[PDB]
Amino acid sequence: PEMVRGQVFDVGPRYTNLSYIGEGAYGMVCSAYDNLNKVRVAIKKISPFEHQTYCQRTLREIKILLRFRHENIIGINDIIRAPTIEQMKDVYIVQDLMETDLYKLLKTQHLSNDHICYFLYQILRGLKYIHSANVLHRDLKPSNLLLNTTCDLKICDFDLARVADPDHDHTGFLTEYVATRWYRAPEIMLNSKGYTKSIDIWSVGCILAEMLSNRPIFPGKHYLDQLNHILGILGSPSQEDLNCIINLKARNYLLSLPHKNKVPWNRLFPNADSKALDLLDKMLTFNPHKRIEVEQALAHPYLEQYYDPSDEPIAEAPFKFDMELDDLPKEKLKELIFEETARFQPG
Ligand SMILES: O=C(Nc1ccc2n[nH]c(-c3ccncc3)c2c1)[C@@H]1CCN(CC(=O)N2CCN(c3ccc(-c4ncccn4)cc3)CC2)C1
């Protein structure tokens, strides 16, 4: 078994000639040569079985991507693991190899408007399909948007994805959250568990702003500083939005703040297209109930050159009910991971 940066990649006969891409808490991602399709692929080695939370995230990643088939969503081409549950210690997930991600691209290049427009179109096209399956991505950010030189974009990383549950979205003020700080909607800090589609639209708004200036729009240094950044640009919420805030503590907090005027989008982004900023405004709407939905965003004048509902497919088989992985022990989750990966075994 070949080694990369001091890690055993036991991918067997089908995959050889490895090369390091990146790393994270999840494990390591590498490029490899596929000996059955004759093309280079991405392979990531995951070792989650010692903790329930790592098993939940691994089962979410696998279960969702196996049920999706869309041009703007990374697939899972193969999964390698041991023939028995007793011997399964690692899981290797094989995916299409891309050239870079939007995080890396924005460090080296300023994007023209027509690149921004096409990338935004693909993000929303993929998100329409996700949301049509009643699924929430919950961690959209530049490093989860994969790109190639032909400018194809694919959304990856569904380890925080959940089935939408608007009836159980409520939570208290300043409730802990797992998804990436800078892309969190204001309601996450005020009254929301991130169980509605609107959570993803806010993240897309953040990504659009980031493509317009090569800098994150709301770079909070810590948890409440994230809401300081959001309110710093959006200004004080309206009386109507305060009347929608649910929590006594959230309402008291917002009423205690000095009045702050809205920073105009054309001052933050003086060289941006006016239609891009009108769409940005609608995605970065404070009240999640008034925030634009994915189908409305695709229909916005900024994306009119690409908008074609007949070429923006939806899911055939939406997730009807919640996955219910929150109260399952790590041993049960290992069994489910084993069962979900069975279709890739020889025999
Ligand atoms: O899918 C992912 N990345 C991909 C995919 C295909 C690509 N093709 N081309 C590229 C590419 C990117 C950049 N530049 C050039 C090319 C790809 C990148 C990322 C990598 C990780 N993945 C999520 C994931 O697989 N999981 C969620 C987290 N989970 C998890 C979390 C933590 C731990 C953990 N274990 C031990 C200690 C601490 N934490 C274990 C499991 C494992 C499953 C999202």
C-beta neighbour count of 45 within 10 angstroms: 20
Q: Which residues are catalytic?
A: 139
Using CA atoms, how far apart are residues 151 and 334, in angstroms rounded to an integer? 37
The response to whether 28 counts as a known ligand-binding position is: yes
CA distance 122 to 118: 6
Structure's resolution in angstroms? 1.7
The C-alpha atoms of residue 253 and residue 250 are separated, in whole angstroms, by 5
Cα–Cα distance for residue pair 174/188, rounded to 1 Å: 8
What's the burial of 259, exposed, middle or buried (CB within 10 Å: 0-12/13-18/19+)? exposed
Buried b (16+ CB within 10 A) or exposed e, 142-178: bbbbbbeeeebbbbbbbbbbbbbeeeebebebbeebe
- Going from N- to C-terminal start, the domains of the chain cover 1-97+327-347, 98-326
Q: Which residues contact 26 (CB under 8 A, 6 or more apart)?
A: 44, 46, 57, 159
Tell me, using a 6 A CB cutoff, whether residue 142 lines ligand 1: no
Shortest-distance Cα residue to atom 22 of ligand 1 = 157
How many angstroms is it from 43 CA to the middle of ligand 1? 9
CB-based contact 116:212 (threshold 8 Å): yes
Closest CA to 91 of 57, 41, 49: 49
CA-to-CA distance for 300 and 307, rounded, in angstroms? 8
What does residue 291 show for φ and ψ, rounded to 5 degrees?
-70, 140
End-to-end CA distance of the chain: 23
What stretches of the chain show up as alpha helix (H) in DSSP? 52-67, 102-108, 113-132, 187-190, 198-213, 223-234, 239-243, 248-256, 265-268, 274-283, 294-298, 330-340
CATH number at 98-326? 1.10.510.10
Q: Are 200 and 161 in contact (CB under 8 A)?
A: no
CA distance 116 to 209: 10
Radius of gyration of the chain (CA): 21
Beta carbon of 44 within 6 Å of any ligand 1 atom: yes
* Determination technique for this entry: X-ray
How far is it, in rounded angstroms, from Cα 249 to Cα 77? Answer: 47
CA 294/CA 276 separation, integer angstroms: 15
The verdict on whether residue 347 carries a ligand-binding annotation is no
Task: Report d(CA 247, CA 245) in Å as an integer.
Answer: 6
Q: Which fold has domain 1-97+327-347?
A: Phosphorylase Kinase; domain 1 (3.30.200)
Render 248-314 in DSSP notation, one character per residue. Answer: HHHHHHHHHSPP-PPPPHHHHSTTS-HHHHHHHHHHT-SSTTTSPPHHHHHTSGGGTTT--GGGS--
Give the ligand 1 atom nearest the CA of 55: 41
- The residue type found at 100 is T
Nearest to 26 by CA among 91, 99, 96: 91
Q: Classify 174 in phi/psi space as left (phi over 0), alpha (psi -120 to 50) or beta.
A: left
CB atoms within 10 A of CB 58: 25
Taking the C-alpha atoms of residue 296 and residue 133, their distance in angstroms, rounded to an integer, is 17
**Ligand 1 site, residue 26, Cβ cutoff 6 A:** yes
| Residue 91 assigned as binding residue | no
By the 8 A CB rule, do 205 and 140 touch? no
User: Please, what is the Cα angle at 345 between 342 and 346, to 5 degrees?
Assistant: 150
